[PDB]
Design a protein around this ligand. Structure first.
Ligand SMILES: *C(=O)CCCCCCC
Ligand SMILES: *C(=O)CCCCCCC
Ligand SMILES: *C(=O)CCCCCCC
Lengths: 61, 211, 37, 58, 37, 58, 58
């Protein structure tokens, strides 16, 4: 999250308190199809990877 | 001397006169805006980082380097041999008589070498520099100079380097250990500085003396 | 000596002048972006 | 004037999260810490003593 | 001596200049990938 | 100037999780720690003393 | 320069789980710890003293 914020233009000081609740770290997996052309779309699977309770209404960045 | 005219460090006029604003145009409005110099798009939530030529940026000089080395070696050797026939029996007098076989010898050797070296330096302060070029990958070349004159002489603190924008903190400041081609300089003039150069004769001897 | 002219470690000019931005194109927009690298 | 020069080869997967690497993880490390001025000149041996240190019998 | 020119341990230039990236191809994409080794 | 040189043969299954091996697990270990300059010259024996150390009777 | 040389014969069922054997389980153990340089030369006896140590009457 700090990497993303820094990339966007906001530098959070280091060694500071930060406890979020609406964010989860996920692994995304997909299947590259045959003869795939750039611009097309595929379906992805999103899976939690640490101590999260649910991904009910989330959005993948 | 103190009567020889010298120019001050801060030259020119040290005051400015306010200029009267323009006469308001007689539309139906009370709000009158003097000609506003339009500056470009400015983000709202992003930190105030320098982005173009001429922007300022604070450097926090904190340098602390310290290196050292040493070594040694040694060696030693002793030896001491002896032999003495005090009372020789008669039947042996033809071989060990008249002290013809007594012997005594000694020997020694020693060596000790050693050496070492070290170096160190520190630096602490704060200095605001200015961007003078934007590189092809977003890095900023920065240069800066601060001149002080406390009652007798003049000290100069100059700085130059290259900064990566993603290292600038939220308060528009970078520690000097994150600058790539750091050139720092802290010099002075006046007789206080002249009292710290070696005399030409001593400087010559320091280089050409045999020892 | 201290009177012999030597060059400083940081050479060249130690200041820069800001350059005026481009004149905004007269589309219907307030957002004007100078040529972005 | 003091000069600190460095040269080496770095493996990207060793760079920390704050864009920093300890110098013990660099392969062909060349480090140099030298100086000039009369402070540095006061630490070279005299040519006669340097000659004796090499050619003296003991 | 201290005036005899010696070469430093770290030789050559101790700085590098960033090179401008390639011009993006005008497909319908924002993602442009420079030639990846 | 000090030089630390190393050469050897490593078995991959001995490399730790942090890409590191203790030097006691290298087979043909050649380690070298030498230097130059007058600090190193002040630690060689004089040629006469070196000759005596070998050819003296005692 | 110091040299540590080793030679021997090992029975595989004595190798531990970490690929290590204590040297007391090797059959024809030949161990050698020698050196060279003047530090080693300062530990040989002089030829005259060596001669006397063998041929002196007492
Ligand atoms: C101030 O007026 C000092 C100038 C004196 C310099 C020359 C003295 C002979
Ligand atoms: C500064 O002006 C010192 C120059 C003196 C060098 C030569 C002295 C005879
Ligand atoms: C530095 O310039 C020292 C050179 C002196 C070497 C020869 C002295 C007679």
């Amino acid at each position: 999250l700090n990497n993303m914020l820094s990339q966007l233009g906001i530098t959070v000081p280091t060694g500071t308190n930060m406890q979020l609740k609406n964010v989860a770290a996920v692994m995304v997996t997909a299947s590259y199809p045959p003869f795939a052309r750039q611009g097309q779309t595929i379906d992805v699977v999103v899976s939690s990877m640490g101590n999260a309770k649910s991904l009910r209404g989330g959005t993948l960045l | 001397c103190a009567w020889i005219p010298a120019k001050p460090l801060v030259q020119g006029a040290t005051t400015a006169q306010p200029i009267p604003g323009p006469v308001p145009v007689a539309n139906g409005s009370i709000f009158q805006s003097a000609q506003p110099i339009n500056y470009g798009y400015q983000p709202l939530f992003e930190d105030r980082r320098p982005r173009n030529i001429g922007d300022t940026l604070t450097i926090v000089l904190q340098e602390n380097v310290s290196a050292s080395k040493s070594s040694s070696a040694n060696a030693s050797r002793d030896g001491k041999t002896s032999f003495g026939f005090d009372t020789v029996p008669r039947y042996l007098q033809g071989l060990f008589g008249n002290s013809r076989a007594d012997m005594e010898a000694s020997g020694g050797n020693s060596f000790n070498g050693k050496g070492g070296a070290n170096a160190s330096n520190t630096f602490s302060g704060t200095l605001t520099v200015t961007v003078d070029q934007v590189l092809a990958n977003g890095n900023l070349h920065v240069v800066g100079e601060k001149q002080i004159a406390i009652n007798q002489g003049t000290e100069f603190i100059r700085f130059s380097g290259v900064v990566n924008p993603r290292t600038i903190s939220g308060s528009n400041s970078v520690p000097s250990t994150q600058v790539a081609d750091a050139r720092i300089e802290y010099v002075g003039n006046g007789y206080i500085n002249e009292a710290q150069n070696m005399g030409w004769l001593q400087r010559f001897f320091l280089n050409l003396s045999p020892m």
